[PDB]
Design an enzyme around this catalytic site. Structure first.
Site, PDB file in Angstrom:
ATOM      1  N   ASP A  70       0.746  -1.258   0.001  1.00  0.00           N
ATOM      2  CA  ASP A  70      -0.099   0.008   0.031  1.00  0.00           C
ATOM      3  C   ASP A  70       0.942   1.272  -0.025  1.00  0.00           C
ATOM      4  OD1 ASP A  70       0.468   0.788   2.975  1.00  0.00           O
ATOM      5  OD2 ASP A  70      -0.314  -1.684   2.977  1.00  0.00           O
ATOM      6  N   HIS A  96       9.298  -5.019  -1.539  1.00  0.00           N
ATOM      7  CA  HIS A  96       8.652  -6.058  -1.843  1.00  0.00           C
ATOM      8  C   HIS A  96       7.721  -5.965  -3.043  1.00  0.00           C
ATOM      9  CE1 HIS A  96       8.803  -9.338   1.830  1.00  0.00           C
ATOM     10  NE2 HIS A  96       9.783  -8.943   1.198  1.00  0.00           N
ATOM     11  N   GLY A 142       7.122  38.121  23.922  1.00  0.00           N
ATOM     12  CA  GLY A 142       6.992  39.445  24.828  1.00  0.00           C
ATOM     13  C   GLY A 142       7.534  40.810  24.165  1.00  0.00           C
ATOM     14  N   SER A 143       7.090  41.826  24.756  1.00  0.00           N
ATOM     15  CA  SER A 143       7.514  43.199  24.461  1.00  0.00           C
ATOM     16  C   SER A 143       7.396  44.049  25.814  1.00  0.00           C
ATOM     17  CB  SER A 143       6.545  43.838  23.380  1.00  0.00           C
ATOM     18  OG  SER A 143       5.221  43.897  23.698  1.00  0.00           O
ATOM     19  N   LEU A 167      10.083  44.412  20.836  1.00  0.00           N
ATOM     20  CA  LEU A 167      10.909  45.411  21.469  1.00  0.00           C
ATOM     21  C   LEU A 167      10.983  45.567  23.090  1.00  0.00           C
ATOM     22  CD1 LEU A 167       9.581  48.864  19.817  1.00  0.00           C
ATOM     23  CD2 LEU A 167      12.038  48.094  20.038  1.00  0.00           C
ATOM     24  N   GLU A 222      -0.087  36.072  19.816  1.00  0.00           N
ATOM     25  CA  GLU A 222       0.725  35.080  19.660  1.00  0.00           C
ATOM     26  C   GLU A 222       0.318  33.940  20.728  1.00  0.00           C
ATOM     27  OE1 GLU A 222       3.952  37.572  20.431  1.00  0.00           O
ATOM     28  OE2 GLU A 222       4.655  37.413  18.493  1.00  0.00           O
TER      29      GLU A 222
HETATM   30  N1  LIG Z   1      10.919  50.080  15.723  1.00  0.00           N
HETATM   31  C1  LIG Z   1      10.860  48.726  16.014  1.00  0.00           C
HETATM   32  N2  LIG Z   1      11.990  48.055  15.613  1.00  0.00           N
HETATM   33  C2  LIG Z   1      11.953  46.684  15.788  1.00  0.00           C
HETATM   34  N3  LIG Z   1      10.871  45.903  16.258  1.00  0.00           N
HETATM   35  C3  LIG Z   1       9.726  46.948  16.533  1.00  0.00           C
HETATM   36  C4  LIG Z   1       9.724  48.178  16.455  1.00  0.00           C
HETATM   37  N4  LIG Z   1       8.383  48.509  16.829  1.00  0.00           N
HETATM   38  C5  LIG Z   1       7.719  47.538  17.204  1.00  0.00           C
HETATM   39  N5  LIG Z   1       8.474  46.236  16.908  1.00  0.00           N
HETATM   40  C6  LIG Z   1       8.109  45.137  17.196  1.00  0.00           C
HETATM   41  O1  LIG Z   1       7.368  44.641  16.045  1.00  0.00           O
HETATM   42  C7  LIG Z   1       6.597  43.773  16.264  1.00  0.00           C
HETATM   43  C8  LIG Z   1       5.104  43.993  15.824  1.00  0.00           C
HETATM   44  O2  LIG Z   1       4.635  45.303  16.583  1.00  0.00           O
HETATM   45  P1  LIG Z   1       3.255  45.024  17.277  1.00  0.00           P
HETATM   46  O3  LIG Z   1       2.260  44.403  16.634  1.00  0.00           O
HETATM   47  O4  LIG Z   1       3.088  46.371  18.106  1.00  0.00           O
HETATM   48  O5  LIG Z   1       3.541  44.067  18.327  1.00  0.00           O
HETATM   49  P2  LIG Z   1       3.116  43.822  20.019  1.00  0.00           P
HETATM   50  O6  LIG Z   1       1.747  43.974  19.999  1.00  0.00           O
HETATM   51  O7  LIG Z   1       4.050  44.580  21.187  1.00  0.00           O
HETATM   52  O8  LIG Z   1       3.416  42.211  20.208  1.00  0.00           O
HETATM   53  C9  LIG Z   1       4.701  41.908  20.659  1.00  0.00           C
HETATM   54  C10 LIG Z   1       5.320  40.950  19.786  1.00  0.00           C
HETATM   55  O9  LIG Z   1       5.287  41.014  18.248  1.00  0.00           O
HETATM   56  C11 LIG Z   1       6.552  41.229  18.254  1.00  0.00           C
HETATM   57  O10 LIG Z   1       7.177  42.473  18.540  1.00  0.00           O
HETATM   58  C12 LIG Z   1       6.397  43.640  17.974  1.00  0.00           C
HETATM   59  C13 LIG Z   1       7.183  44.863  18.248  1.00  0.00           C
HETATM   60  O11 LIG Z   1       7.809  44.812  19.435  1.00  0.00           O
HETATM   61  C14 LIG Z   1       7.375  40.194  18.900  1.00  0.00           C
HETATM   62  O12 LIG Z   1       7.042  38.641  18.209  1.00  0.00           O
HETATM   63  C15 LIG Z   1       6.691  40.409  20.270  1.00  0.00           C
HETATM   64  O13 LIG Z   1       6.929  39.135  21.120  1.00  0.00           O
END
Ligand SMILES: Nc1ncnc2c1ncn2[C@@H]1O[C@@H]2COP(=O)(O)OP(=O)(O)OC[C@H]3O[C@@H](O[C@H]2[C@H]1O)[C@H](O)[C@@H]3O
Ligand SMILES: NC(=O)c1ccc[n+]([C@@H]2O[C@H](COP(=O)([O-])OP(=O)(O)OC[C@H]3O[C@@H](n4cnc5c(N)ncnc54)[C@H](O)[C@@H]3O)[C@@H](O)[C@H]2O)c1
Ligand SMILES: NC(=O)c1ccc[n+]([C@@H]2O[C@H](COP(=O)([O-])OP(=O)(O)OC[C@H]3O[C@@H](n4cnc5c(N)ncnc54)[C@H](O)[C@@H]3O)[C@@H](O)[C@H]2O)c1
Ligand SMILES: Nc1ncnc2c1ncn2[C@@H]1O[C@@H]2COP(=O)(O)OP(=O)(O)OC[C@H]3O[C@@H](O[C@H]2[C@H]1O)[C@H](O)[C@@H]3O
EC number: 3.2.2.5
Lengths: 473, 473
Positions: free
Chosen positions: A114, A152, A289-290, A326, A400
């Site tokens: 199969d 086989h 996280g952020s 961030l 997430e």
């Molecule tokens: N100048 C920037 N430079 C770099 N990165 C940036 C900037 N400005 C914002 N970001 C990041 O973009 C993502 C999308 O933005 P967001 O939709 O606002 O994200 P959030 O709601 O904080 O979720 C948090 C989760 O998302 C992602 O990082 C976030 C922000 O931290 C990760 O996976 C986190 O774990």
């Protein structure tokens, strides 16, 4: 829960083998008998009746088919038609085939006609290269993910299927390259014989040749065989005789260094395969996280916390996938670099910064799903972001969390960090069986300690590490 | 009497093969089980009990021995001791072994560890070359009469005997020259498989290789298998199932062009072998006689009679052994020469003139016994000799008759010739069952026609020829 210590040791060893892409699966006819195909004895039942025999009173079906061919002057029309009509039916895949397709296994050896393995591999968008002819060995499909050696024959070519005793007798000459390939794989790869009875003459010949070539230095292979269970109407003495005979057979299997795992039920195979995948799936974590504020801790203290958490995660042979959020992404990178440099492997740290701009926000959702799909465990820290001049709660962490939960990923919301992570922790705690079914006292204590804001950096990191460890194994 | 037409055809074919020294005997363990050795299952009965199994419930004794070895960490001490103690006992030979030793067969292949074949060959003053080791193949005993290939080992070397499954697995590598030799013999010689079950994995492998090499052009081999008989307590249906299974097995044997002869009893093997020897033993006749008077016929007429009788005997593929007696020897020579020259083979005409003188008369008796021992049938003509100026009756013809009768040779006294031959004819006729047991009406009519003095030369010669023919076949 867990299983016997022998099964746990086998799980650990085979997960170690699979993650190094040195593992192969030898699937017999028994792995497909759970799908819905009738047993080969039931297929040969009319054939035996035709020549005056009976399958129930016959132990060797190969000789039965050979007798049937002998009666018809060596013609196999009925047998070819029977196998084509039976093994080409449209049946739904079992969970075992899907699990094996999801595993990072690049070699399958099959004695079943199969195409269930091929179908399972193709459902997972994996390029599978099926080989059942000698000429097919000389050509390799480009960018294949797994090669299935049907040693086989295939169902769509019934005339080439090894069914009768003449086929086995001429196998050593006709299909010699397959014998050589299997001999090479039995010494270069670790096999897991699932649904195989070890009564096939070809396998006996190949294993005997391997043992004669290597003697006591043979590679260790693993097998799964169900223990004998008492039939509905049978004496105790005959059942004990069957068990003794099975124990002797299992011991004789280890002569070729094939360790046999005794399985109480057939459904324990699925539970073993799920454990094997889970030990591999959960090896990758998703640090979500952020943060613009860091709750009770100061910015420097929380940066050190995230840095040391990532360093510990990498030190414990975990794979960190970070969206470069961030406030946590930079410190995760710092921790990973400090641990690794004491080059960067593409498997240890995976960075997926989110494109900034209205054009990238439209693809943000699929980007985030792609990131989370790569992981098995999700860990959430803080989760606030600066908006309109105020520290609002970041909805991306919640998104997430939702995506990971949709994927049956283990969620570990670090409630000591606070903000949206505290809300996530409370949400998981309210219905704990929904997110962590079948938990133990230790797991509940660790989860309740994730929100213990009085913990220091080291204690919290140890709590998270122990939680992830008990999740993975 | 006679047997089934199939058995008669086999007898004719195999006697044709043996007389050309192109026949070989493959003797399994069953040929020795009639001697008194216990069956291999009974030998393994304590061994199976030791590991917790039972032989009566086990079909594969090879795997039983392999399990026993596996329990003892691969040690064969008990098995070696068992086979050495059982197969080295002092037992009397069966008739089959003696008959096979008397036959002109130069090749024996044996799967039995006992030395019964060697002993049978040595009892007949035949130089036998037993080969059971690889190194022994490179040396041939000078002037050997038969070579016994013990392809599984000798009793005096129990450690080398093929008993367990590891032995069979490594046989293809260790004992490869024996496999090649048997493959050569299975295509260059006609085999008679006596007392063999055709379940030996080595024989299956060798026969499959031969068939794969030669396909439908394989040499014809013969086999002897007893038909299944109903056990004392068994249903009719299961007996019919066993018979059907045996018929299928017999048909499957002919796939390798091994014709199987169904034997009602084990004792029919001895009756077949006796027939095969008798068709060879009686191929040589002993023309006894001596004449100075020729009874009713004139000297010229009787000389023509003897000449034409010898010519007819040679023409019918008989071997004439003559003592060059006075009055018949010269005419026998004339007939043989006239038939042959229409060189002299040492097998067609054998002349043993009697040394004349008091020194040769002392050895005359052993000379005559040596002559008669070479033959199978004795024909007596006239038998008078000139002594003291008178035609006395020659006592040498009577002595030859007595010697032939002591050797169980068929005596054919031509009573039409007269003199001491008429007395011999009357002596045989008075007690006909003593000299010709189990005679038919045709044989009695021919014997009574041997004394019909009114017959012409041609009629008497035809009578004698038909008598010798019905004796030989
Ligand atoms: N100048 C920037 N430079 C770099 N990165 C940036 C900037 N400005 C914002 N970001 C990041 O973009 C993502 C999308 O933005 P967001 O939709 O606002 O994200 P959030 O709601 O904080 O979720 C948090 C989760 O998302 C992602 O990082 C976030 C922000 O931290 C990760 O996976 C986190 O774990
Ligand atoms: O010879 P072969 O081994 O190729 O064929 P087979 O049919 O002889 O296979 C029998 C083997 O497959 C396993 N098996 C049988 N039925 C099964 C089922 N429904 N689910 C899972 N495993 C099963 C058994 O443990 C046994 O070892
Ligand atoms: O395996 P293997 O064949 O070497 O050994 P075996 O003991 O399996 O031999 C069995 C074969 O020998 C014959 N046989 C068994 N007992 C016999 C006896 N007493 N006399 C004559 N023939 C007998 C049977 O016909 C059978 O075919
Ligand atoms: N000058 C001779 N020249 C040659 N051969 C001679 C001479 N003189 C005698 N013979 C032969 O010697 C044998 C022994 O002698 P025996 O003992 O007298 O013999 P027999 O009694 O006649 O028996 C007859 C059977 O013996 C053998 O031939 C006889 C004689 O014919 C045969 O096998 C017979 O079939």
């Amino acid at each position: 829960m867990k299983m016997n210590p022998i099964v746990e040791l086998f799980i650990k060893d085979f997960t170690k083998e699979v993650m190094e892409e040195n593992a192969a699966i030898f699937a017999g006819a028994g792995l497909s008998m759970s799908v819905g195909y009738v047993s080969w004895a039931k297929l040969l039942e009319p054939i035996a009746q035709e020549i005056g025999l009976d399958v129930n009173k016959e132990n060797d079906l190969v000789s039965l088919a050979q007798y049937y061919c002998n009666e018809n002057q060596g013609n196999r029309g009925r047998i070819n038609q029977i196998i084509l009509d039976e093994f080409s039916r449209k049946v739904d895949l079992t969970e075992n085939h899907k699990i094996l397709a999801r595993l990072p296994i690049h070699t399958y050896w099959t004695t079943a006609y199969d195409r269930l393995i091929e179908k399972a591999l193709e459902e997972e968008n994996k390029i599978a290269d099926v080989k059942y002819t000698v000429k097919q060995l000389a050509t390799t499909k480009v960018k294949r993910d797994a090669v299935v050696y049907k040693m086989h024959g295939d169902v769509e070519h019934p005339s080439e299927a090894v069914l009768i005793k003449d086929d086995y007798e001429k196998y050593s000459i006709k299909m010699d390259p397959y014998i050589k390939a299997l001999s090479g794989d039995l010494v270069s790869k670790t096999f897991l014989f699932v649904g195989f009875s070890f009564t096939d003459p070809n396998l006996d010949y190949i294993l005997s040749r391997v043992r004669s070539a290597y003697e006591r230095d043979q590679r260790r292979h693993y097998c799964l065989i169900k223990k004998e269970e008492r039939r509905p109407d049978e004496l105790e003495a005959d059942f004990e005789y069957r068990v003794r005979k099975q124990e002797l057979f299992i011991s004789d299997l280890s002569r070729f260094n094939i360790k046999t795992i005794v399985l109480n039920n057939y459904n324990e195979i699925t539970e073993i395969l799920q454990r094997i995948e889970n030990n591999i799936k959960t090896k990758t974590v998703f640090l979500s996280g952020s943060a613009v504020e860091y709750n009770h801790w100061e910015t420097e203290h929380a940066e050190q916390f995230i840095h040391q958490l990532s360093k510990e995660l990498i030190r414990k042979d975990f794979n960190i996938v970070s969206g470069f959020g961030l406030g946590v992404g930079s410190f995760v990178i710092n921790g990973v670099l400090e641990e690794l440099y004491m080059t960067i492997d593409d498997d240890r740290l995976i960075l997926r910064p989110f494109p900034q701009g209205k054009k990238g926000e439209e693809q943000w959702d699929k980007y985030r799903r792609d990131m989370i799909t790569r992981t098995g465990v999700s860990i959430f820290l803080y989760g606030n972001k600066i908006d309109k001049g105020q520290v609002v709660k970041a909805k991306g962490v919640q998104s997430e969390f939702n995506i990971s939960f949709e994927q049956n990923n283990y969620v570990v919301p670090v409630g000591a960090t606070g903000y949206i992570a505290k809300d996530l922790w409370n949400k998981v705690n309210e219905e704990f069986e929904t997110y962590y079914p079948g938990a133990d006292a230790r797991m509940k204590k660790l989860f309740g300690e994730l929100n213990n804001e009085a913990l220091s950096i080291e204690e919290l990191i140890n709590t998270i590490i122990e939680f992830v460890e008990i999740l993975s194994n």
